[PDB]
């Protein structure tokens, strides 16, 4: 992981020579008197009437002597270390590294500070080390490909880092520019970018000099096309990616429709003491059209939870909160075609529910008479064809049986 | 300034011609501007429809179960992770996949292609080129398993023609397919193994569970902190491997040069606990289990071994070595007809020296529902069988079913000890299966299936020690297995003493093989298996009493098997010489002894190598162990 | 004026406090407001899934031809 270490140390090495470079323009003041290093050290005034811009301001900035060296030194270290990974990894390309953009802000920023070594009175001499930071912002980049330090987090975290460059590049051009007309500081020129990336442009602060106009269109043409290909990213990753309380109960079914939906909430939901309770669906199929239209209903949408999912996904379980469920109904899909496959479910799904939950009231609705003696060990079953048949038989016997009993096991309060 | 709604104001139009000109360019640009924007909507819409050393995965249908065992055995040895992973596959990704893929560990690691290995344009997108391997991996979901190994060939062809030099890792389904990627580097038959594995568990309880263990990379750490002492126990002796060194270079065997294979074994297991299980020659290119006492070692050897850790990751017990710092083995050493089947179902066949009837026997008499000319028996009672029955319930009787019958007939077992074999099957067998079959002594068919009480008392369940359920039967992908898991559990129900042992395609529904939902023990064995999943052990369905008890199987292990090749390129050659799969000559076979109190005067494990190394030259694999667990 | 991007300018912050507030400001509420749209997106999009004298038409499958 050596190699990670060496792009970690340029990282800061670029944001460390960013900061110098801010450290030098709050302790460069250019009322004190401006000039090339030593001699003939000239004051200056900006005049509004007269077109012509003094470019002694903008060309030099007095450079400290230890700033001058220090800057020098993590200058050349971080061209050491670029060109480092430059001759370490050719990949079977000699040519093409100059035009990918990032070598040519590399040696602009870096190697005037390399030249100004040879002639003395060149050390008080501009050179956009604010510039730098969109390196920094190239060397984080690469460092997501490998360590996270959450898939999206990097995209927004880059999202930014590319607001903050614009910003800094924004601040110390115009603070720079300015220095020749109306002296601006790094405060205020920070203030002028700020209003003027989020298009408020109050205009106390606007640049008075071409010079400055045009770094003012050219920053806002800039971010106008490279903010929009982050928000593209963005969009592209947002979109991928799209694809409570105590005392709940779990719904465990196969295929959940409205009208077994809707006999689950009209009965559970008849009890006072069952209001407080919300009502989880696991069913791994996904959400039925008319479901959806119910469970959009206020009344609905904060007690019932729908999870697509299987009881046989310990995960899914876990989903469910199903070790902390006041009870889970395991009820058998009457509509297919094949009930002993349904019956066999639904076997699977209460001993699913029986392992991850030994302490859960299993509820359990199975259809064919042979394969009750599987979920004996539930708290409750039903057989769906004892039940019919013997109904159905005794209306042979006492008429009207089956409407006696179905009036009997619904709640109601006798008003109809 | 104004087109981007800065507006300064610093320059503004002072006239009422430049002032009505800037509103009628604002409303312009606000007219002409979205049009365009709508254009480069309608474009985008219409549009939306590495490193070094990767590894490419080609399914047909990548579902969540494959995939992450797959990444589980992969990424278990750090000499893979620096590899990135190409799956390609015809199908769109799936749901329960995209998750996964989404996790931050996987997003960069996990390359998912929607392509054909037919199409060299999709195997260009995939750098099969420059993969260092190419996992070809049949679908067992797809119902037509003719179909789904005619794909795994042809994409195991387009690969080879694509890059010819890509090691190529096939998994194969039917034994009838297997001789057309020969070719390949590794080949893995599901039906052989599975029938193999299946018969092995008749003769040698639990041999699919020890098989499952060794091919499954672990460090030895499951169940480390229960407080029982054989889940303890257990869990540390799952971490065992198979792993190879040269002689010369193995500071477990170097001593050993110029002394016998068993001397060395039992001395290099009393000293460090290692298994020497058998060796390959510099000469040949075949390893032999057990070569025995008249091998003599050389440094040229390389010795396959099972030990918790390669000896060069033991580099702890050698300086733990330095921290410290019976007879004895020596250095120096109807009857049946006895034969080779005659008809070989399928081109590979290894062919194995079985117990042979002295003449074939007529398809009528391989028929144990029908009476005959020869005989009027019926059922299973009228036969009067010495021996227990072992009762196959199978769908189709094929090669693989074979593959059941040769390790139960074989040469090197008892005679007196045979057991019949009654095929319990769905459909009427082809008259290729019976003349495959007809030669074998006590092999009988039956029509019927596990879910019907009738044909099983017909069978002789009353009277078999196996019952072996290969019945084959979702969106669901779990619920797979629940009409096997459930007509299964309806015979533990019947017959509680009989022993059934099935194969499941999930390991996650082992645990339903025989469930006592009102059982403390085996509920309270679900949180163990939660915790060892919490601990990202690949082997978490360890501790299930079925599985440990070699009951249940799933032939997603034999997935594992394929991957560990990627590392181990002995380990499939291992597990089918211990499965008696591929036979050469001067190599061992697996077989079990019981421990009767007459052996208890052999107090311990280190005790029973020296006796067994010192006069039969057997080498002890390890013990299956019965405890008193009262329900 | 300012949350609404206008700017006219007319009033402005003219001390480094007051400024750096508005600064502040416009960074909590281009941070603040987008979570809010983005909840209002996940909503608006499970959502998505006259006169006297009408007759009904009730069909199993209406296709062009019918119609
Ligand atoms: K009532
Ligand atoms: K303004
Ligand atoms: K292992
Ligand atoms: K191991
Ligand atoms: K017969
Ligand atoms: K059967
Ligand atoms: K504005
Ligand atoms: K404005
Ligand atoms: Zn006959």
Not at chain 1, 296 to 319: E, F, H, N, T
Not at chain 2, 203 to 221: E, F, K, M
Not at chain 2, 424 to 438: G, M, Q, S
Not at chain 2, 614 to 620: D, L, R, T
Request: hydrophobic share 45%; aromatic share 12%; with cysteine.
């Amino acid at each position: 992981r050596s190699s990670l270490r060496i792009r970690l140390f340029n990282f800061s090495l670029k944001l460390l020579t960013c900061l110098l470079y801010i450290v030098r323009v709050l302790l460069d003041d250019p009322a004190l008197g401006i000039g090339c290093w030593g001699c003939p050290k000239q004051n200056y005034s900006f005049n509004d009437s007269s077109s012509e811009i003094n470019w002694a301001p903008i060309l030099w900035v007095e450079r400290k002597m230890t700033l001058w060296a220090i800057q020098v030194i993590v200058a050349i270290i971080s061209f050491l270390e670029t060109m480092l990974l430059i001759y370490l990894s050719y990949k079977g390309n000699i040519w093409e590294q100059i035009f990918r953009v990032s070598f040519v802000l590399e040696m602009i920023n870096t190697l005037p500070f390399i030249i100004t070594i040879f002639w003395p009175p060149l050390r008080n001499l501009f050179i956009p080390v604010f510039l730098n930071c969109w390196l920094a912002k190239h060397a984080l980049e690469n460092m997501i490909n490998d360590f996270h330090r959450s898939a999206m987090f990097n995209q927004v975290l880059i999202l930014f880092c590319t607001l903050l460059c614009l910003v800094f590049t924004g601040t110390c051009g115009i603070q720079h520019l300015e220095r020749a007309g109306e002296n601006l500081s790094l405060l205020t020129s920070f203030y002028f970018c700020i209003v003027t990336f989020s298009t408020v442009g109050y205009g106390d602060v606007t640049p008075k000099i071409w010079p400055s106009q045009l770094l003012v269109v050219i920053m806002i043409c800039v971010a106008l096309v490279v903010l929009p290909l982050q928000f593209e990213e963005l969009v592209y990753l947002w979109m991928e990616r799209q694809k409570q309380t105590e005392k709940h109960v779990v719904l465990c079914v196969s295929s959940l429709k409205i009208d077994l939906l809707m006999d689950f909430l009209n009965e559970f939901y008849a009890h006072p003491r069952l209001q407080d309770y919300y009502v989880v669906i696991l069913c791994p199929t996904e959400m039925d059209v008319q479901v959806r239209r119910v469970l959009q209903i206020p009344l609905w949408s904060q007690r019932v939870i729908y999870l697509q999912g299987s009881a046989l996904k310990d995960q899914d379980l876990m989903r469910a909160k199903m070790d902390n469920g006041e009870a889970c109904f395991i009820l058998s899909s009457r509509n297919e075609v094949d009930r002993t496959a349904a019956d066999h479910q639904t076997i699977l799904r209460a001993w699913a529910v029986k392992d991850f939950a030994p302490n859960c009231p299993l509820y359990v609705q199975i259809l064919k008479p042979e394969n009750k003696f599987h979920v004996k060990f539930a708290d409750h079953v039903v057989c769906e064809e004892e039940c019919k048949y013997a109904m159905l038989a005794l209306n042979c016997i006492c008429p009207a049986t089956s409407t006696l009993i179905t009036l009997l096991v619904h709640t109601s309060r006798g008003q109809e | 300034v104004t087109f981007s709604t800065v507006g300064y104001g610093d320059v503004t139009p002072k006239i009422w011609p430049s002032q009505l000109l800037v509103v009628i360019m604002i409303c312009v640009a606000l007219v002409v501007l979205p049009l365009q924007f709508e254009e480069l909507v309608y474009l985008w819409m219409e549009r939306q429809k590495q490193t070094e050393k990767h590894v490419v995965l080609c399914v047909s249908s990548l579902k969540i179960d494959l995939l992450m065992d797959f990444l589980n055995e992969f990424y278990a040895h750090p000499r893979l992770q620096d590899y990135y992973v190409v799956i390609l596959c015809p199908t769109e990704m799936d749901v329960q996949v995209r998750r996964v893929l989404q996790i931050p560990l996987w997003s960069q690691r996990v390359i998912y292609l929607q392509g054909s290995a037919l199409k060299d344009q999709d195997l260009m997108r995939a750098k099969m080129d420059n993969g260092e391997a190419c996992f070809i991996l049949s679908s067992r979901n797809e119902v037509d398993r003719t179909a789904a190994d005619h794909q795994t060939i042809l994409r195991a062809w387009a690969v080879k023609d694509f890059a010819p030099n890509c090691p190529l890792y096939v998994q194969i389904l039917k034994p009838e397919n297997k001789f057309h990627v020969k070719f390949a580097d590794h080949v893995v038959c599901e039906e052989e193994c599975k029938y193999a594995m299946l018969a092995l568990n008749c003769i040698c309880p639990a041999t699919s569970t020890l098989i499952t263990l060794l091919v499954h990379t672990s460090r030895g750490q499951e169940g480390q902190e229960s407080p029982e002492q054989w889940q303890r126990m257990y869990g540390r002796c799952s971490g065992n491997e198979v792993y190879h060194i040269r002689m010369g270079d193995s500071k477990f065997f170097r001593e050993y040069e110029g002394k016998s294979f068993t001397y060395a074994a039992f001395h290099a297991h009393k000293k460090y606990g290692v298994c020497l299980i058998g060796l390959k020659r510099e000469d040949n290119k075949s390893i032999l289990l057990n070569p025995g006492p008249r091998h003599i070692l050389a440094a040229s050897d390389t010795c396959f071994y099972i030990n918790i850790t390669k000896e060069e990751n033991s580099a702890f017990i050698f300086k733990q070595e330095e921290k410290r710092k019976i007879a004895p083995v020596l250095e120096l050493a109807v009857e049946y007809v006895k034969g080779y089947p005659p008809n070989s179902p399928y081109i590979g066949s290894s062919p194995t020296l079985c117990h042979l009837l002295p003449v074939k026997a007529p398809f009528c008499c391989l028929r144990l529902d029908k009476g005959c000319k020869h005989n009027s028996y019926e059922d299973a009672k009228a036969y009067g069988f010495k021996n227990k029955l072992i009762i196959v319930s199978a769908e189709t009787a094929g090669n693989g079913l074979y593959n059941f019958i040769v390790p139960l007939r074989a040469y090197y077992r008892s005679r007196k000890e045979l057991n019949p074999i009654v095929l319990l099957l769905d459909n009427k067998p082809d008259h290729h299966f019976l003349e495959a079959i007809c030669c074998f002594p006590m092999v009988y068919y039956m029509e019927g299936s596990v879910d019907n009480l009738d044909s099983l008392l017909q069978c002789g369940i009353i009277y078999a020690d196996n019952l072996v359920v290969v019945d084959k039967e979702a969106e669901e992908d779990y619920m797979a297995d629940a009409k096997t898991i459930v007509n299964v559990q309806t015979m533990f129900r019947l017959f509680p003493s009989l022993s059934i042992t099935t194969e499941l395609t999930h390991p996650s529904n082992m645990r339903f093989m025989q469930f006592r939902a009102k059982d403390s023990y085996s509920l309270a064995l679900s949180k163990l298996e939660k915790r060892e999943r919490e601990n990202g052990s690949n082997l978490a369905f360890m501790f299930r009493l079925p599985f440990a008890a070699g009951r249940v199987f799933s032939i997603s292990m034999l997935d594992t098997l394929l991957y560990q090749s990627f590392v181990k390129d002995y380990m499939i050659t291992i597990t089918r010489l211990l499965l008696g799969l591929d036979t050469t000559p001067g190599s061992g076979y697996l077989c079990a002894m019981k421990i009767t109190e007459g052996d208890l005067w052999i107090r311990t494990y280190g005790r029973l190598f020296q006796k067994l190394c010192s006069s039969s030259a057997e080498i002890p694999i390890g013990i299956y162990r019965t405890e008193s667990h009262v329900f």
